[PDB]
Symmetry: C5
Subunit: 307 residues, 5 copies
């Protein structure tokens, strides 16, 4: 059972695809195991770069393929390197840039909490053939959080485990529990842009919506909300065009519907005040003057939308 030691170096995690639930990761893989002692030129370890690695394999060098389980497509592999030591040991070092998959929940945008995951597992060798001895991940990140889209929080989380597959080859003794490495990097979204450029003005839009009750005439009260209605649509447009596409409603999407709700509610109330009367122009002096009622009733509905 060959013991394989892994070391992952993470350079950059970028380009999150919200729709595809995807993120790109650039870095290096280092895999080490001990083989049969070799005769190296001179006696210091022998270096075999890119092209030449295949040539060594053709001569029977065992270099096991390690698969990125949760990779989308196949990674762009940069430089490959084999370091052959005379005492037997082998070090496979290669740089990669890959597109990775993971379950991502974006409901509480733009205050989402995400975790970037890497899953490594031998493609052909089961737990009894190839075994992951240990793994350390180096997240060589730091500083300038206010410049980056994501703020990495913890340090790299690591777990070597054994994955059992129920439907495999015509093999029955016990060859089915491949050993799998799982790396986890926690991150939080930089909410600064969405607060100041979306939440804030949306708030002012919704706030200024309530100012329709301070209008004197009914004709004024009603027609203005059509302009106000037209505003929320215009804002829904600007929102939807810039925010990331998802198959569900976010906090902001809820806020927009709530905006649509306030205006349509105002429309009903304004009409109600005017034509529900006991003479003709009896605009319910108090209901037309609900100028504080549903702004704070909106603060009640606002606190429940979070609940």
């Amino acid at each position: 059972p060959v013991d394989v030691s892994v070391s992952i170096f993470i350079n950059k995690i970028y380009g999150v695809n919200t729709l595809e639930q995807t993120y790109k990761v650039d870095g290096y893989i280092v895999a080490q195991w001990t083989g049969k002692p070799r005769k190296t030129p001179g006696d210091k370890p022998l270096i075999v770069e890119n092209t030449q690695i295949e040539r060594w394999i053709n001569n029977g060098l065992w270099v096991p393929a390690l698969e990125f389980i949760n990779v989308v497509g196949s990674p762009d592999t940069g430089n490959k390197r084999l370091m052959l030591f005379p005492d037997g040991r082998v070090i496979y070092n290669a740089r990669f840039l890959g597109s990775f998959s993971n379950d991502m929940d974006f409901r509480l945008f733009p205050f989402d909490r995400q975790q970037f995951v890497l899953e490594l597992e031998p493609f052909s060798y089961n737990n009894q053939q190839l075994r992951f001895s240990d793994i350390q991940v180096y997240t060589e990140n730091i500083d300038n959080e206010e410049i980056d889209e994501w703020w990495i929080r913890g340090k790299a989380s690591t777990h070597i485990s054994d994955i059992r597959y129920d439907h495999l080859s015509s093999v029955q003794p016990n060859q089915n529990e491949f050993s799998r490495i799982t790396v986890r990097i926690d991150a939080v979204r930089n909410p600064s842009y969405y607060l100041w450029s979306f939440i804030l003005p949306l708030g002012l839009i919704i706030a200024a919506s309530w100012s329709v009750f301070w209008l004197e005439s009914f004709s004024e009260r009603l027609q203005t909300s059509f302009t106000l209605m037209l505003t929320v649509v215009a804002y829904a447009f600007y929102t939807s065009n810039i925010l990331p596409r998802l198959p569900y409603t976010t906090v902001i999407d809820q806020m927009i519907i709530a905006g649509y709700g306030s205006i349509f509610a105002a429309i009903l109330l304004i009409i109600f005040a005017h034509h529900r009367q006991a003479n003709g122009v009896e605009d319910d002096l108090l209901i037309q003057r609900c100028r504080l009622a549903f702004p704070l009733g909106f603060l009640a509905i606002g606190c429940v939308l979070v609940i």
Copy 2:
């Protein structure tokens, strides 16, 4: 006639292109057949990964090319693996991510029922040369439906069949019935986002559109519906920018046309009310009070879209 057993493992179905009628599928293919017994090291199966497979083929290993009939372009092949057994049997395992084609009807969007199809067929070997014995498809997906865009319903539809080509090679006896595996996975679109962020507020727009008749003056009644027209255009725009591009009208597209219609009808009625008179400002108390006539008359247009 070589009997081949196939097993498909579906990891991810994502990235639907509505216009090209395209969807992406990531997974593994496993194909197995029994060859002439080989003498493997020890007696345990011999493993051959990626690069080395080609070399073995040059030495006379028969590894049949299985074509994905309904693939767009050529799929990204990840790791390749040949498992050679001493008793003869051969197992081909490879990871793939491909863009596949299938007829997709998006008329009743966002309430689609779609089906993702895979069609496997040997590229050069007919039914009498190579025949598909059986296939099981493993959709190891489950849970968290409200996070994913599509909801997979059944397990997997499977069908091995024989395709006759009328125009083929220089063969006339019977080399023309290639065997095809056809895998079908049914899915329904997650309508949650589109209902709350598109359907609902559109309804309120159309709803509030009719409130233009509760205006007192003729000028108020008329001028306001222009703002209302401008509202539907703005909403039609917001719709088009976000929704999937199609070469036909959807339910949503139809609602928008209906929006244009309701406003245009009111325009006609409002002008009519004022100018259908025996003096000049005889605004027909019944027609200016079509405040219940065509709002629920629109519910007839709504039931006709359902019929």
Copy 3:
């Protein structure tokens, strides 16, 4: 002069690029020619798939490169196959997906008539060396016309010709008339979508534009025409953002100009009526009642533009 038989199988024509005058074609090419008889294992036809073809070419197998004259870039080749018959004949079969170029006029969009073209020609062997004997094209298409963007007219038109190049190598006898196969597929755009979702609502806009004349006051008449102006711009935006990009104006584009024209023309009349007087407020009783003049005057200008 080697006689070559060609068969093109068209699977899907999609992805028309309006600006580049380009369309994507997925399908198979089959080329057959008769060489000197071979000794195949047994006597059974020999099959050579992908990788192995190059090995045969290195050993002196003549497989002429057949170039797609009008392809942009180089096509995505799927599976390749050499079928070598013992009587001599050789069959090259390969799947391809390519982006093809052709002159495309989109002026009378969305009512275009286009034709999808393929041009095959030997890359290195002239007519006296290699000549295209015959070609059949199989467009295994039919049905689902109102689900698809294009309606195919013919089945497939073909023309084998000899292309004379006037400026080539320092060769003078007669080596310059390469034989070319040209396949043509006629198609018509399904204008239904653009009619209901673009032509129609634009029409309602222009129509309701004319309703500016049923307004009483001058201030109403003029101020309303500014909201009307803003609506057409809103529509111009919505149109261009969704419709295909071209280097010229379409039928839809002209309607938009016509909308702008009607309103600016209306602006001129409305101002004219008020200030062209014999007192100050003598609004010309007939010119203010141009409520029918240019609605049918636009239908006159509209019907003349069709000429």
Copy 4:
């Protein structure tokens, strides 16, 4: 010093990238030079296609690499062909699609004059080793300019020159004047689409903007210009979203700014007219009748833009 004759065939120039100053060219390069006499099969010239050229190079065929100096990235090479003559001469033929760079000034859009340039130069061989004897360029183009985006003007300008590099290897005699072929093709933009769908309606907007002075009331005069301002915003949006992205202002971009100014200037006067009084509402009968002042002052300021 090997005399090399080159012939460039241009099939298609498309896909201008305004920001990157890039354009795509599809075509063929043909290179001919005379080597030491060969003994060819039969005695007529030998043809070598794609794959086989590398094999010939491995056995000592000198095929010099010709670099596209102004290519961005590395070109899509189609078919390669070596034609080996017994009298010595060798003819290299290959099809290419490449993205080329050139300084492109788009200031006077959509009335650009552009020139598409190709620069060819040997990668490793200087003027005394390899020299370009002559070059002819064939633009096999013609007809239907009103169908294409760019109108090719000239035929093709040609220039073989000697390029001196001052910093190369530690080499000193005179090995620094690589011979370079420079192909230039002039073209003019088809302004039809931009004129009718952008210049004109923008023009009508700016013109009709001035109709703000024929309004009676101050409130009307002022409030209308807010709708007028909102229109230019809408138009700026529609323009910029469709127009090519640039790092400078175009003619059309200038038109838009001119619109903002016309409207803001109107706002200032309208406020000015009103509060510059001998009572409160004494609007200077001539300043309210600046209905002719700055419309023709706009044509005076407009012609200065030509200066």
Copy 5:
């Protein structure tokens, strides 16, 4: 420790990705070192182009892989060349196009000062094996600044240094200090487009926003600011649709927020004017006359952003 001299030629820096913090660089690398003296054909230096370089590596030619540290993905390599001199020395010349990463601060857009960086490091050989002797970078650029998006300032900054890695093999002597070349190119953004087409009219919107106080009636004063609000919304959209996406607010983003604030302040003031009274109709003749108060009160808040 092999002394390697490097020379980078920068052709084009283009395509900045604001979110990914990425820029594309086209150019050449030249690497020179002295090997063991060779016997070259004739006696003049031997040239080895593209394909043949691998062949030399197989026969034992040491050609060290020099890795681009801050490269995203793997660069597109154009022509490769090995120049082998008889005295021993070897020169590697290769053209490259790569996407590079660097910390990029875009806060003060469109007035960014950016620096484009290249980082070279040997992939497999440490400081005691391979040492960077010296490096010169040639940015053969100059002139035509008003045409390009970025204005290159310096002549290019250099830093040859030694990077220590702390976590590698079970190696203890001193092999962990790879030598790294870092090239820096300073650049400034061409702000012209964003000033005239974004900064300028946005200011006019804000300026004209204040003109709401020159309105006489209360309803006019209040209702007009809703058109004004909708305009800033309209403008926020146009800004966002054209300007580059970032995870933080820029000056322009701030200008828009300043607008939303200015208008909301007016809404509150206008409402305040109307209802804070000692009679009923005391619309503060003085506070409605803040027509100069917060135009300069906005200039007080505005000048604070410079400090």
